[model samples]
Target: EDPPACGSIVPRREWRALASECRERLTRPVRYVVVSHTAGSHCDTPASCAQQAQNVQSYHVRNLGWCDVGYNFLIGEDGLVYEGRGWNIKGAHAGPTWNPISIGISFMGNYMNRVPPPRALRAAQNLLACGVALGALRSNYEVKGHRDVQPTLSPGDRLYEIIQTWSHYRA
Candidate 1:
């Protein structure tokens, strides 16, 4: 199915409305947004790309024994952001302690091979802004690449460089 509209993709209004409901229920205010790349090596073709990407997410949830998609949200190369485990629920992207406290967002493409499309970056920025506004983040929230926390070489150098540059832009 085609991805939903930008405004509808996140269900921002719905999340905003529900934020209050999670305040007392949550352990703490959500902080830290970790950005990651789906690091599978088989996404060269269009069909394979989409399937491989989805499989990786499912693997994390089903095989790796996670609650759902590791990330709270996932942005595809098509510039579509798929809602992963949902916002209020914690994620399994970052390692143990970090997973419960941080909100994880990942991109479906292996950016180590090429830079993400402009639209992809734009979508990420918009999502980040929304995350901040929804009280899911602290005023000093940090946005770090997956490599910053994990030992893997995910999100590639070129894309990681861009993310760093964008981080400064957001700051």
Candidate 2:
């Protein structure tokens, strides 16, 4: 149930490439992009920690028989972009109906209790920028925490506050 290596761990170019490919394949243009975070633990180093977190995230997503990973892309604590389910395939991270229509992105490590490293924040902003450029998003596309949609405390309070600051999101 380990996540597929795919290629680069957070390659912006690859993410763009995959997103472009997925956009072409999708029947409807993606609208809202949701973000989640792994709030369990952190590693000593950001890069390795993010990778390790991605491993755990991928494992959970794979165990569910998701196409690849539950998310379209993943941002590591190290500010790296790890390719997940790519773009075209439906996601299992969110509720059933929402998964197919929305692009799901997750970051490793929980932010509810702890503040995310700067690297993670930087990577998230970059990913959002990519989403905006691809015509897959609206100027105000909702950047919601998982808790906003579901009853879980995912993406944490502190992280959710940070997400609010993103241009695309509203509190």
Candidate 3:
């Protein structure tokens, strides 16, 4: 089998993220991929996207008092991936039922009215491929929209519809 090509990922420090206090581990080769959206500001430039990433982390850590940014990774309109809790750590997204079994990846903006840029979608897809390559996600992993597994409208209407067309998406 050929190795998967990984997309460029910006480290937490690059986004000026605060230190994470979360320590719970996720079992490797996770079978599910839960997609969501920040439902906040959209950042199309690297500088702005980095700041948006920071804002998300601050909200999760300071306001919500969570251990860290909830998603395993955050995709930016700048076509970059920002590391969150990352591959092996459990995420706080998608509620209690799916968090432990899936990897959470969120887009940097609300997709209810508009869709994310093509590059941003490409970045997320590449991240999933990278996860499988790194043995963090199972080869036969199933992707799910946040609303599919949770009660909330998390991934937004347009994004949720787009992911349903993904080869790996289930239900």
Candidate 4:
């Protein structure tokens, strides 16, 4: 695909990802967005983040036996977005109910005790803007924390708190 409207994305092929067959799609102008964290190591360089993307993909596909990496996109401290299921595909990040209706984006590391660097945060915002620009997300889309729909401490305390302050975040 061509570069998204607002920011650049690192396509799956660039990360040496295994081929995935998941084809379920999300309805366009998606109304909801779910944000989460990988609870793994963080990388501040493109080289290291690419490796982390592969590691997460391997865990999901090889260990967990999923169709592919769960989130629609993964953000890195290197200030990049790594394509996962991508824009139109339904993601496995949220539960079944939310997955089909929303796009899932996960940060590369846990946010319980640490915050993603500002650049990474900006990268995620840019991705969201890109979604809207591509007409894949509603202009007034609502953002949800992974914990909001699931009964788990998914996106972590600090991250959760920060997201609540976002203009698009819903209670």
Tell me each candidate's TM-score. 0.74, 0.74, 0.96, 0.96
- TM-score head-to-head 2 vs 4, winner: 4
Query: Which candidate number has the best lDDT?
Result: 3
Candidate 4: where is the Cα deviation over 4 Å?
1-4
- Could you give candidate 4's per-residue lDDT for residues 1-171 as a string of tens digits? 775347589999998889987989999989999999998889999999999999999999999999999999999999999999999899899888999999999999999999988999899988998899889999999999999999878788888888899989996
Error in Å for residue 44 of model 1: 12
- What TM-score number comes out for model 4? 0.96
For the record, the alpha-carbon RMSD of candidate 3 to the native fold, in angstroms, is 2.0
Selected candidate, larger lDDT, 2 vs 4: 4
What is the per-residue lDDT of model 1 for residues 47-77, given as tens digits with 9 covering 90 to 100?
Answer: 4545554676557755875545566776766
Report the C-alpha lDDT of model 3 over 1-171, residue by residue, as the tens digit: 565466579999989999899999999989999999999989999999999999999999999999999999999999999999999899999988999999999999999989999999999998999889888999999999999998888799999999999989998
What is the lDDT, from 0 to 100, of the residue 61 in candidate 4? 95
> lDDT (CA) for every model shown?
0.64, 0.64, 0.93, 0.92
lDDT of 2 by residue, 1-171 (tens): 476323335543433321222222333357777778755665545457545645554466456543344567777666676666655566667786667677778777678778778877877777666656556556567777778777788888888888878777743
Model 2 residue runs over 4 Å out of place are: 1-28, 43-54
For candidate 1, list the clashing residue pairs, or say none.
none
Task: Give each model's clash number.
Answer: 0, 5, 0, 0
Task: Tell how far residue 35 is off in model 3, in angstroms.
Answer: 0.3
Worst 10 residues of 1 by lDDT: 17-26
